[PDB]
Each structure stands twice: as structure tokens, then as C-alpha cells.
Amino acid sequence: SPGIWQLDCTHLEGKVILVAVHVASGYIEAEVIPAETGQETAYFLLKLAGRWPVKTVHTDNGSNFTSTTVKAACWWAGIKQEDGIPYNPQSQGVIESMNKELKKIIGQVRDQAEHLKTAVQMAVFIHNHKRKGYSAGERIVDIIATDIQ
Amino acid sequence: SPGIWQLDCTHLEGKVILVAVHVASGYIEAEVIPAETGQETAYFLLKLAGRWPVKTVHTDNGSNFTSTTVKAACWWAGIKQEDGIPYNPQSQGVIESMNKELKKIIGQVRDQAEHLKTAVQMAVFIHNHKRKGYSAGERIVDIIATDIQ
Ligand SMILES: O=C(O)c1c(CN2C(=O)Cc3cc(Cl)ccc32)ccc2c1OCCO2
Ligand SMILES: O=C(O)c1c(CN2C(=O)Cc3cc(Cl)ccc32)ccc2c1OCCO2
Ligand SMILES: O=C(O)c1c(CN2C(=O)Cc3cc(Cl)ccc32)ccc2c1OCCO2
Ligand SMILES: O=C(O)c1c(CN2C(=O)Cc3cc(Cl)ccc32)ccc2c1OCCO2
Ligand SMILES: O=C(O)c1c(CN2C(=O)Cc3cc(Cl)ccc32)ccc2c1OCCO2
Ligand SMILES: O=C(O)c1c(CN2C(=O)Cc3cc(Cl)ccc32)ccc2c1OCCO2
Fold first, then answer.
1. Quick one: a GO biological-process term for this protein (chains A, B) (predicted)?
2. Which of A30, B39, B53, B93 has the fewest CB atoms inside 10 Å of its own CB, making it the most exposed?
3. CA A12 from chain center: how many Å?
């Protein structure tokens, strides 16, 4: 459980926002890229796995799942690469709802920055700090620290 | 002390590596930028503070300490911006030692990537996972989680 993350890709202003969600807490990291390519996904995962203990990643689509660059990064980083098929058929709805909420947050800060990438990082900040009550950031630290503490 | 971070800026291959260290654990995040400007430092801090609970940052120099773009990001993110003067005079050697170690790691992976930014993120991964027997990544989550609970 504490090592599991889900990748998610969404589009806004003709750019791509790649998101990784820590499935047990709802904590996220996100970046703006020009387009989702295996190389960008690989580098996003290498960043993520240097910062948090990423044991398993459910990939967002079959292109990333197949990408040899992605598989090379997963190998390098000790990550088990898995599919992101909604085996629980409520996973597709959860992912859609997350993107809608993320885009709502982005719209709430959009005017405070020139560049979309800045507004996305403001939106990561607001989501991870939001109380609902613990925040996502509190939950992920409690989850991982319990895992041997 | 669980919210305290130190910024640090080092140079390699004619590029700038900006580093934030979590003082109590030694955990780091790092990025490659063309040059240290207020805008890049501000954006780096906004990313950091969306991901970890950053209460105080000791800035790496007086230009960032003065930068109104940095001060605006610190206000936005709820960060107390402080100087990074080694009032504890060993603090100078500790920072240069960290840079030399980081550049050693980078040299150990440099050949496995075309682009410096990828080698820096590999180095972040290796440092944060290194056992010294707990890792930096383990220490920071234990520090912050003990603070929550
Ligand atoms: O409120 C949401 O819908 C939301 C969520 C909801 N969420 C959880 O709490 C757990 C979880 C697992 C997965 Cl697989 C996807 C989303 C979520 C996560 C991230 C977000 C969200 O909203 C916007 C920004 O990021
Ligand atoms: O206008 C922008 O998008 C931008 C900004 C804009 N801006 C400021 O000038 C002060 C500030 C605080 C915060 Cl919390 C967010 C954005 C900004 C800062 C750094 C950047 C930016 O672009 C991307 C890289 O660095
Ligand atoms: O402030 C939060 O909601 C938060 C927290 C909350 N919190 C803790 O549980 C421990 C802690 C220490 C400090 Cl000194 C400030 C806030 C927190 C932890 C990690 C985060 C957070 O938000 C950013 C993502 O990581
Ligand atoms: O071994 C080191 O010197 C080292 C350190 C040492 N370190 C700690 O453990 C605590 C600490 C506080 C501060 Cl203010 C600076 C460095 C460190 C941190 C990060 C690194 C390091 O080397 C590799 C890259 O990151
Ligand atoms: O050659 C690079 O530096 C690079 C790479 C190189 N590379 C692979 O092709 C597979 C791989 C695994 C890992 Cl663990 C690190 C780098 C690479 C991937 C993504 C990138 C890169 O550069 C920019 C960001 O995206
Ligand atoms: O693997 C580590 O050394 C590590 C850890 C170590 N560890 C824990 O304390 C709990 C845990 C759960 C899992 Cl499932 C894997 C590793 C760890 C935590 C955070 C990190 C780590 O390294 C990456 C940065 O964040």
C-alpha cells in the first residue's frame, strides 16, 4: 500500500499535465510538459522515485506501459511497473474527478501567474495542503512512517 | 526543526544546480537551471513547499534573500524566509562538503544519461536512498511524522 502510485495525464491550454497520485493518501506531484512521450514520463518517474519510496506505479496508458525508456527508468529506480486498468471499475471515475478538481484549482489561481507551469505547482500546493481532518501531505507522511516506525 | 530547509546553489558543466536540503535529515531535492535568478529560485521554492511542509528556508545568498519574486513566493507559500549565514561557523564546510559529494555522485552516473538534468535526478535518488542504518528519505518522513503525531 504505502509504495503505490497512479500516473494520470490531462490536457489544458494545449499542453499536457502529467500527475502522479499516491493512491492511499491522495497526495500528488505534477508537471507541465509539451506532450506525453516515453522520455518525459521516464524523467518524471525518476524525479518522483528520488523523492518518495515508489514501489509500484500503475501506468496511465499502454504507450507508457510499453515504452522502453519508461521500462528502463522503472528498472533503474527499482519500480514495479503495472497497468492502470480500473480492475475496480470505479477507478476511471475517480481519475476523471481528480482531473476536474485539479483543473478547478488551476482556474482559481490561473490569474496569479503568467505561465501555466506555475499555476499547476500552485494547484499541487493547494491540493496537498487542503484539509478534509488531515491533509494529503499529512496522510502520506503518516502512511509511510508507519511502514516500519 | 522539521520545517527547516537550506537552499544551496552549485555549478557544473556551465549550468547551475539548485539544491534544497532538509537540515535535520539531509534529504534533498535538486534541479538544473541555466542561471540562478529570482524567478527560478521562486519557482523551485513553490515546487518544494507543495511537496513537503516548508516552514523556514535559509536562503543561499543575499540576492535571493532580497529578490522580490522570491519574497512573493515565500509569502504565497507561507514560508519564513531567513538568511543562510553560518552563525554556527561549521555550516560553511558542511555546504561545500555536500556539493563535492553531490558532484561525486553525478560523476558516478554521468555516463548513463545524455542530459545533465537526468544525472542530477539520479544523484538525488542515490543520495536520498543511501543508508548511513537509516536513509535520508527514511529520516525526513520519521521527523515530520513524529511532529504530526
Ligand atoms: O479531490 C480529488 O478528487 C482529488 C484526489 C482524490 N484522491 C484521493 O484522496 C485518493 C485518490 C486515489 C486516486 Cl487513484 C485518485 C484520486 C484520489 C486526489 C488528488 C487530487 C484531487 O483533486 C484535485 C487535485 O488532485
Ligand atoms: O509568471 C510566472 O509564471 C512565474 C512567476 C510569477 N510570480 C512572481 O513573480 C511571484 C510569484 C509567486 C508565486 Cl507563489 C507564483 C508566481 C509568482 C515566478 C517564477 C516563475 C514563473 O514562471 C515560471 C518559472 O518561474
Ligand atoms: O501542512 C500540511 O498539510 C503538510 C503536512 C502536515 N504536517 C505534518 O503532519 C507534519 C508537519 C510539520 C510541520 Cl513543521 C508543518 C506541517 C506538518 C505534512 C506534509 C506535507 C504537508 O503539506 C505539504 C505537503 O507535505
Ligand atoms: O554527504 C553529504 O555531505 C550530504 C549531506 C549531509 N547533510 C546531512 O546529513 C544533514 C545536512 C544539513 C545541511 Cl545544511 C547540509 C548537508 C547535510 C546532505 C545532502 C547531500 C550530501 O551529499 C550528497 C548530496 O546531498
Ligand atoms: O538522456 C537523457 O538524459 C534522458 C533520458 C535517458 N534515459 C533513457 O533513455 C532511459 C533512462 C533511464 C534513466 Cl533512470 C535515466 C535516463 C534514461 C530519459 C529521459 C530524459 C532524458 O533527458 C531529459 C529528460 O528526459
Ligand atoms: O527507500 C528509502 O530509503 C526511503 C524511505 C524508506 N522507507 C520507509 O521508512 C517506509 C518505506 C515504505 C516503503 Cl514501501 C519503501 C521504503 C520505505 C522513505 C522515504 C524515501 C525513501 O527513499 C526515497 C526518498 O523517500
1. symbiont entry into host cell
2. B93
3. 16
Closest C-alpha residue for ligand 1 atom 4: A98
Instruction: Report d(CA B30, CA B41) in Å as an integer.
Output: 11
Nearest to A142 among B43, B46, B148 (CB): B148
Using an 8 Å Cβ cutoff, are A129 and A140 in contact?
A: no
CATH of the domain at A38: 3.30.420.10
For residue B42, give the C-alpha cell: 521562486
Number of domains in chain B: 1
Distance set, CA B74 to CA A4, A79, B45, B82 (Å): 31, 34, 8, 10
Nearest CA distance, A82 vs chain B (angstrom): 21
Ligand nearest to the CA of B135: 6
Q: B9 — phi, psi (to 5°)? A: -130, 130
